[PDB]
Amino acid sequence: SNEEQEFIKRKHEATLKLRQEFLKQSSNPYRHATGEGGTVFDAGLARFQAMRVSNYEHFKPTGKSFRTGLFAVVLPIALYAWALKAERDGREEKYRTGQVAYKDRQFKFI
Amino acid sequence: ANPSPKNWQSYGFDYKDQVEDRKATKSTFFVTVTLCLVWGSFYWAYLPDTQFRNWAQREGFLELRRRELAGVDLVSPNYVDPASITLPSDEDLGDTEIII
Amino acid sequence: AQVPLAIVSHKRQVCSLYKRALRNLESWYDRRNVYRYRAVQLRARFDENRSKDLGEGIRLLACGQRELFETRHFQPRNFANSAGGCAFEREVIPPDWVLDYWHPLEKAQYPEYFAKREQRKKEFVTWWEKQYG
Amino acid sequence: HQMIIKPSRFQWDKFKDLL
Amino acid sequence: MGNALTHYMKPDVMPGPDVVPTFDPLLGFKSRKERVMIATQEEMESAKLPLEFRDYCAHLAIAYQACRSDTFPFVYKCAHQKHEYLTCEYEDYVLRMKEFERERRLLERQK
Amino acid sequence: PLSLKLINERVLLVLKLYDKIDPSKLNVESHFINDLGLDSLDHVEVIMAMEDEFGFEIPDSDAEKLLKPADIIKYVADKEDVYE
Amino acid sequence: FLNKSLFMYNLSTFLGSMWFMPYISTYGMIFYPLNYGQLVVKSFDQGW
Amino acid sequence: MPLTSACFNVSNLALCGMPFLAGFYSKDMILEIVSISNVNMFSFFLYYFSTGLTVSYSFRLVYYSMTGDLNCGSLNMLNDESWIMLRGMMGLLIMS
Amino acid sequence: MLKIIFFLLFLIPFCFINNMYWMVQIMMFFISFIFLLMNNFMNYWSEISYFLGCDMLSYGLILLSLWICSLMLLASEMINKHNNYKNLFLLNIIILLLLLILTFSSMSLFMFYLFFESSLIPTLFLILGWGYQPERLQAGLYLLFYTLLVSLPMLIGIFYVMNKIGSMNFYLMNNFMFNYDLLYFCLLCAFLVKMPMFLVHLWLPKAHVEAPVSGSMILAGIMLKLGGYGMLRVISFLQLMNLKYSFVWISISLVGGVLVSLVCLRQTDLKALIAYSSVAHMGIVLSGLLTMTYWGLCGSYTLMIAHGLCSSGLFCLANVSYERLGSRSMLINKGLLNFMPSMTLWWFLLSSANMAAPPTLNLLGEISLLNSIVSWSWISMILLSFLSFFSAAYTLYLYSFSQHGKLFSGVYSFSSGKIREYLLMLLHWLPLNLLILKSESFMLWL
Amino acid sequence: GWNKDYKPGPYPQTEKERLAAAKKYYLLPEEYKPYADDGLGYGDYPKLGYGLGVEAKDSYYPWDYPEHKRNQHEPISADHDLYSEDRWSQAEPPRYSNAYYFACFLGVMSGCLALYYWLDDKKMYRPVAAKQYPSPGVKHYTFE
Amino acid sequence: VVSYRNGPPPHSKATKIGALTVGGAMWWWVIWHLWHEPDHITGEFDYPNSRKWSNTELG
Amino acid sequence: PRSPMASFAESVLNVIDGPITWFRESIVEPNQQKQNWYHQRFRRVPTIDQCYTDDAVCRFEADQQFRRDRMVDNEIVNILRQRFEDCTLYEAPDHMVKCRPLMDQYEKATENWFIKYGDLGGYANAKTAYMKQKHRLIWERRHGPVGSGM
Amino acid sequence: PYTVPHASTYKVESVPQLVEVKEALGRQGLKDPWLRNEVWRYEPKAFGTHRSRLNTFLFRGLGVGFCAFLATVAVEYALGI
Amino acid sequence: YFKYNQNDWTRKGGWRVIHSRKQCVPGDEGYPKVSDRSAPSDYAARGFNESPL
Numbered sequence A: 001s002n003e004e005q006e007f008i009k010r011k012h013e014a015t016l017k018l019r020q021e022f023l024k025q026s027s028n029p030y031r032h033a034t035g036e037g038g039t040v041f042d043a044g045l046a047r048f049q050a051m052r053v054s055n056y057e058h059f060k061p062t063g064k065s066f067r068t069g070l071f072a073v074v075l076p077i078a079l080y081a082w083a084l085k086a087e088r089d090g091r092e093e094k095y096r097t098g099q100v101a102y103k104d105r106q107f108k109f110i
Numbered sequence B: 001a002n003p004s005p006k007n008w009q010s011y012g013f014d015y016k017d018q019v020e021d022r023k024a025t026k027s028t029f030f031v032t033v034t035l036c037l038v039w040g041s042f043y044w045a046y047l048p049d050t051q052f053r054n055w056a057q058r059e060g061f062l063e064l065r066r067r068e069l070a071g072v073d074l075v076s077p078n079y080v081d082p083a084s085i086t087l088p089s090d091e092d093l094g095d096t097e098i099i100i
Numbered sequence C: 001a002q003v004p005l006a007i008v009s010h011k012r013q014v015c016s017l018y019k020r021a022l023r024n025l026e027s028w029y030d031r032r033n034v035y036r037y038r039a040v041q042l043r044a045r046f047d048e049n050r051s052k053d054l055g056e057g058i059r060l061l062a063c064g065q066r067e068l069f070e071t072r073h074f075q076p077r078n079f080a081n082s083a084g085g086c087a088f089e090r091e092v093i094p095p096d097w098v099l100d101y102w103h104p105l106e107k108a109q110y111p112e113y114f115a116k117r118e119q120r121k122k123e124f125v126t127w128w129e130k131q132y133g
Numbered sequence D: 001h002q003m004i005i006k007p008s009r010f011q012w013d014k015f016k017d018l019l
Numbered sequence E: 001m002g003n004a005l006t007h008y009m010k011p012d013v014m015p016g017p018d019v020v021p022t023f024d025p026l027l028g029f030k031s032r033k034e035r036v037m038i039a040t041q042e043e044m045e046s047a048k049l050p051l052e053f054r055d056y057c058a059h060l061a062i063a064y065q066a067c068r069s070d071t072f073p074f075v076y077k078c079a080h081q082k083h084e085y086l087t088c089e090y091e092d093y094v095l096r097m098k099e100f101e102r103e104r105r106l107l108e109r110q111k
Numbered sequence F: 001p002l003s004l005k006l007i008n009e010r011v012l013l014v015l016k017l018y019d020k021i022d023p024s025k026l027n028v029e030s031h032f033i034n035d036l037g038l039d040s041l042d043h044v045e046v047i048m049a050m051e052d053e054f055g056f057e058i059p060d061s062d063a064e065k066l067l068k069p070a071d072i073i074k075y076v077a078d079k080e081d082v083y084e
Numbered sequence G: 001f002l003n004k005s006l007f008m009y010n011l012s013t014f015l016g017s018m019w020f021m022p023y024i025s026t027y028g029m030i031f032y033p034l035n036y037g038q039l040v041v042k043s044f045d046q047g048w
Numbered sequence H: 001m002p003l004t005s006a007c008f009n010v011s012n013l014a015l016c017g018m019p020f021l022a023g024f025y026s027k028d029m030i031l032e033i034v035s036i037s038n039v040n041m042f043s044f045f046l047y048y049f050s051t052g053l054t055v056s057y058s059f060r061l062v063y064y065s066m067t068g069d070l071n072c073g074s075l076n077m078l079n080d081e082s083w084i085m086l087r088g089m090m091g092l093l094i095m096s
Numbered sequence I: 001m002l003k004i005i006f007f008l009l010f011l012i013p014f015c016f017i018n019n020m021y022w023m024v025q026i027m028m029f030f031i032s033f034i035f036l037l038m039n040n041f042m043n044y045w046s047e048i049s050y051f052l053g054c055d056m057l058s059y060g061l062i063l064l065s066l067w068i069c070s071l072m073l074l075a076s077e078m079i080n081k082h083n084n085y086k087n088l089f090l091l092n093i094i095i096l097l098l099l100l101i102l103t104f105s106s107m108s109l110f111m112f113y114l115f116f117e118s119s120l121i122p123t124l125f126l127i128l129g130w131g132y133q134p135e136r137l138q139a140g141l142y143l144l145f146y147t148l149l150v151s152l153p154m155l156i157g158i159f160y161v162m163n164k165i166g167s168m169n170f171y172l173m174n175n176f177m178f179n180y181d182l183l184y185f186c187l188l189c190a191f192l193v194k195m196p197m198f199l200v201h202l203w204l205p206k207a208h209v210e211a212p213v214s215g216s217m218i219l220a221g222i223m224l225k226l227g228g229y230g231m232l233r234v235i236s237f238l239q240l241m242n243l244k245y246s247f248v249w250i251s252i253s254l255v256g257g258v259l260v261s262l263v264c265l266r267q268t269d270l271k272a273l274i275a276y277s278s279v280a281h282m283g284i285v286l287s288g289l290l291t292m293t294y295w296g297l298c299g300s301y302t303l304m305i306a307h308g309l310c311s312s313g314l315f316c317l318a319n320v321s322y323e324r325l326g327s328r329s330m331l332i333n334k335g336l337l338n339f340m341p342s343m344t345l346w347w348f349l350l351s352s353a354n355m356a357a358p359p360t361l362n363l364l365g366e367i368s369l370l371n372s373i374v375s376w377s378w379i380s381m382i383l384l385s386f387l388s389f390f391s392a393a394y395t396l397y398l399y400s401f402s403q404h405g406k407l408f409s410g411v412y413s414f415s416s417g418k419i420r421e422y423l424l425m426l427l428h429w430l431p432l433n434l435l436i437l438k439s440e441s442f443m444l445w446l
Numbered sequence J: 001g002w003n004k005d006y007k008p009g010p011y012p013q014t015e016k017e018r019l020a021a022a023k024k025y026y027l028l029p030e031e032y033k034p035y036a037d038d039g040l041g042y043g044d045y046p047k048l049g050y051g052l053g054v055e056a057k058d059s060y061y062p063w064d065y066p067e068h069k070r071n072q073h074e075p076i077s078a079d080h081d082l083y084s085e086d087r088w089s090q091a092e093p094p095r096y097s098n099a100y101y102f103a104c105f106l107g108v109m110s111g112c113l114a115l116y117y118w119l120d121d122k123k124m125y126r127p128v129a130a131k132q133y134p135s136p137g138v139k140h141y142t143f144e
Numbered sequence K: 001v002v003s004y005r006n007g008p009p010p011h012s013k014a015t016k017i018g019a020l021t022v023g024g025a026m027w028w029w030v031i032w033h034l035w036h037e038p039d040h041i042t043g044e045f046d047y048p049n050s051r052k053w054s055n056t057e058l059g
Numbered sequence L: 001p002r003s004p005m006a007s008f009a010e011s012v013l014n015v016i017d018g019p020i021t022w023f024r025e026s027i028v029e030p031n032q033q034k035q036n037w038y039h040q041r042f043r044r045v046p047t048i049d050q051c052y053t054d055d056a057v058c059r060f061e062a063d064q065q066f067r068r069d070r071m072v073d074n075e076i077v078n079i080l081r082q083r084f085e086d087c088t089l090y091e092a093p094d095h096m097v098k099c100r101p102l103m104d105q106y107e108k109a110t111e112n113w114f115i116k117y118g119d120l121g122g123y124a125n126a127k128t129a130y131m132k133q134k135h136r137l138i139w140e141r142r143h144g145p146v147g148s149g150m
Numbered sequence M: 001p002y003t004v005p006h007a008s009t010y011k012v013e014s015v016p017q018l019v020e021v022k023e024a025l026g027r028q029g030l031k032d033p034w035l036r037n038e039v040w041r042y043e044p045k046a047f048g049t050h051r052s053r054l055n056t057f058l059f060r061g062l063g064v065g066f067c068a069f070l071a072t073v074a075v076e077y078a079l080g081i
Numbered sequence N: 001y002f003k004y005n006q007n008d009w010t011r012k013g014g015w016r017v018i019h020s021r022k023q024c025v026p027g028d029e030g031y032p033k034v035s036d037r038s039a040p041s042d043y044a045a046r047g048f049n050e051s052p053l
């Protein structure tokens, strides 16, 4: 397609302008000679930083988000708490009833 | 080849004059290394029995010397004597949760 | 400073397929004479096939790409010093401005080199003012 | 003998000697 | 395959692995002699012999330990004596290689 | 340790070991298509010959940007960092 | 000669790539923890 | 590489079990103890067939490197004058 | 005791004298040496002076407070190079250290509460005053409103305990035992927020990032341990009810440790990743606290002591790359082995201390904590292995990506490493290996 | 020059907002493609290449940053950690599917466990009896 | 050293002497243990046939 | 002296043993003053049952002797375990027969330790073990020994 | 690349292993231009052959080992026997 | 340190050395030999049998 080559050529011209800006700013002798450390000002790094920090402003309580928050966090917490409570109750009724001997009980801390 | 004495590289403590760097560097290395790490560790090496762990080992050796001579118990299972403790009767307790 | 352009011609595509096919053939056949015999066989396979049209060439180029993906070696042979090799970029050279952060007593060990560096700094700042200033 | 581009190690050695 | 495979095919003909003598030891009417130990228990446990090596001839192993400690670390100087201890084990193995085999014969005569 | 004369000798030796290139017509400034009769796949064979000779990998854009043996000398001397 | 590694290519890939075991450790079963760490961030750490 | 090839020779035949070397003294004392003890059919298959695999890859490791046609580049840096390296190789060679 | 308190009270006028920044940390290390000398403590309260006394838990926590504040004055030389308000900074640090000493050497629950909630105002002042971010207002408000919202009903619980018992002392309140749900929730949930949970953490990664280096030291070094000290003082009289309701918090803390350990693999900030790293280890501390064993309590005290040093030492390491590379982003921080090779020793020595390490006190705290949690239930062996594997899956990522690889292109020239920074990260790691020697000190507070 | 200045904004409902967001992220309008309108999905941030990781990108291209393989002012992908060069990336696309690899491995494992544990009680043995150990109660005999 | 389309530079006497010395050491060890202990490769002890023993002694 | 290795080890042991014995008997043993240090003996304060509920003086003293008795009984179990470890090292092949009375004594020690201090928790007062003993003796009275209870 | 040679040195007909490939390609009706680039790779003087390399590698010190074994046997019979 | 100031029964923090029984072969003095220690108090004494208390 002839529309693809014009798009690639325009992207290459924009990339060439940004590359010339990077070669101008990266080897700056005055900015190196100030002595204060830092980086060349990249817009995409700041966009990535604010993308990673700020995410509540694009959040809405939809069904997909509720399904993700249920199956990712609350359901393993609920299943793990149910398993721990069931195992501890099953061991505790055997401990309180008296079905286990004194010298035959695990974890005596001895 | 012969560097100037006025072109001095600072340490981390002060960036205005060379006199405050050396005094603060030597004094900060004095109050941390040869006081808090060497003299303090020498003090903590020869610290006395604050916890009674050495006394516990000596008393355990003497008790195991004297308990097996009597031969009643190497470790006593009961906190008090079973004849001294006055247990409540079954009619006295009623429906109380006995825990074991 | 010619930055490469992302558009790839059909002749460039079939040249890249020919290069990758002979690299896979070199990976499969380790002996040089057997690799040379199979390379001449593959060159004859390409040379009997270069007289077709453009759409048939595009479709058979896609078929050749699928075939080369099918016959790709699990451990392809690559040059060690180039990118993607076994020992690419084993050492990382820091930029020279850390040499400007040495101690002056440490700078006294190479005084001719540091004097030449200080001479070259003025040439670099005039070159940067000429280029981007 | 090519000169390797190394960072300054004077402060670490002075820290080791002071310690 | 082999000795395991026949144990899958004819289990009543071929005896199992490391089988004890099931029948009477005096059934063959040899009136065979009794193995008598030379070294007793206290000098067996004095020499720190392991429990897997306290065989019917541990005195040869004790003498091998003595000759190994006599010329240590160059313990090859009485190396043939090691073979002497080894052939005692071989003799024991020969007894074991009979103790299985006649048992199969004793399991064949009843079959 | 290399030199420009040595690398030039490498390039003319590899290009004169090619039987589809006449050594009488071969030159450092000779163009690979207009001056010499080579196919589009023949230049790829020359590029992988230089890859196997000089021991690196030449990309496809740098494969199509080389049209003279002197260009190959300038490309090799830039990669392996020799100018004297 | 017949290339016995080019023939039976599926068997020689399994025996050649060390029983497919670097793929199982690396690029396999690592997307499932790494993406699931992002779902905690996007849904529960910042959203819910 | 005469001396490096000799070291590589001694160590491969030690690995394969060239009689009365270290690898033979360990491997025969492992493998014949198996034949007098209770071993599975599959476990006895995995011992000896993998020993044949071991000699098969170790002699293939010879053939591509030594006693074969060179396939490297036109410029090679083959030399055998790194004598501190080969002194360490002599110490480990006589110990092996 | 009163010697340390009056020492800091008479060290208060050092701030108002000009060019007196470096003498205060000298006298702070001197009083840390004096506090190393006064070590005649056993499990009961000793050096009883009015309402102030000290036992072994209080001794270790005051010594950690003094060491963290003494290194906190050593780390903040950026306050001294600029003309930022050194007198106010020194006064806030001395006042905050005095409040921490007063809330750890408190004989009673109420003075512990009073200086405990007095301590959050200098932390507020450091966060909103000396930070370098526009979101310092989001940092301090989250911290203050989280802790205040869950700590106000704890005061109602504290006076309900006073009205039922009569006394405020820890020993006389150890005798009694309560069977109420809401008293348990009041006296627990404030500490359950003050140490990081999974659900209630939010103030932590949004208050560590936007603070200064000194806010990071005081938050991850001693103010995640106020809640641990509070639970170690409160759990003794709420055993029956916490045995009813502890499976919820232990399960939430263990799954949250696994999940936050999965969060740190998707973190692009050095200072945020250590902020979430404080959540995972204190999750193990919280899971071992509620089992009420001897080993759980001792290993919890050992891991809080060994975590307040290592997390603060990691937060000093992220500061000395933020001062030079100009940002806390993990993409920028790449290949610092070729920039600062001598720092890479302290990066790996303090990142290994965050996981299980051979000579550190963190392993002796982690071993004695996993003992109690595996003893608590066998189902926890599935998720303790996942948590302790993911801990070094993420903790090696921060050292690996910051200290290895190709260099970040387009970085301007910065200064080299300094002897003060090497001394600062020396004193964050040599206490971690010199305290396994005489470890019966820093473990057996019972 | 802070996080409040450069940040993702609201979702581009209209086309002019999409053009302004494309020009904001130094991306041509055709390349720009926002996320979905779901709860998890980001607003106004571009959706970059999720096909294969950084190792798939060309290492022979002259990059402004050779590390991360990106130019200056190029928008970083949102899952840049997951699609980094370190984790879960391949230089070439894989030969097979994801399930074939695991299927062959657990097939070989299931066959080997089955064939071993079927033959666990068919171990071979030499023509040898039990090892006789001396006991004070039980005596043994020789063959001579 | 570097070599082009040819062999290496010729080896020193020490490398050749060392190669023949370590080859002689290995083969001297092999043939010496072959001569002094030939029984280790084969069965060190004899393996008599279990079907060779008479049934008239025990049976 | 019966082996070259034994003679070499004897020579190395003599060269090692010589100068340190010279340094002890020549330098360390002179100039050392004679002093007496004593093992601390504690009187038995009355326990948690022989005092009232309103008194906190008795609770501190009985708690302190309960902690001291806990540390002593822990050292009893530790020394009884170290006896079994020394039996295992000293009787290296024959550890099966000789170490059995020591292992039975150690197992009885572990059982009695779990009778007294078992399941008390991290906060084990002197009154908590006494109430555990009260409930244990009541359960032994009405339900028999624990392990076959109803 | 010191003292590089000319293309007139390398000849296809000198080596058997490349003229076999040339004869097979002539039987198939094809020609190859890169045979002269690999003439140096098979040299009987600089690199030897397959049979000489195996005798060099497997039996490097067999004669010296056999001579030392005869010396050990001769000194063993004078003392041990 | 390890032969004149090793760990005894009055101190916990020292290096507590435990030795195994040496193997006795003939040619040594006293080849008919049993274990010298048989009492439970002789095992792991750490110098308790020479205590002045």
Ligand SMILES: CCCCCCCCCCCCCCCCCC(=O)OC[C@H](COP(=O)(O)OCCN)OC(=O)CCCCCCCCCCCCCCCCC
Pocket: G002, G003, G004, G005, G007, G008, G011, G012, H044, H045, H048, H049, H050, H051, H052, H053, H056, J108, J112
């Ligand atoms: C338990 C179930 C496990 C299932 C796992 C999956 C299946 C495993 C199958 C095992 C058996 C494999 C048999 C061969 C199949 C593959 C053949 C193949 O691809 O061969 C290629 C290659 C030779 O090809 P060639 O062109 O000559 O070499 C150049 C490029 N390779 O070949 C080679 O390079 C080497 C091939 C070796 C094949 C034979 C193996 C060694 C046999 C002899 C030594 C062992 C003898 C043991 C005797 C006693 C046994 C008790």
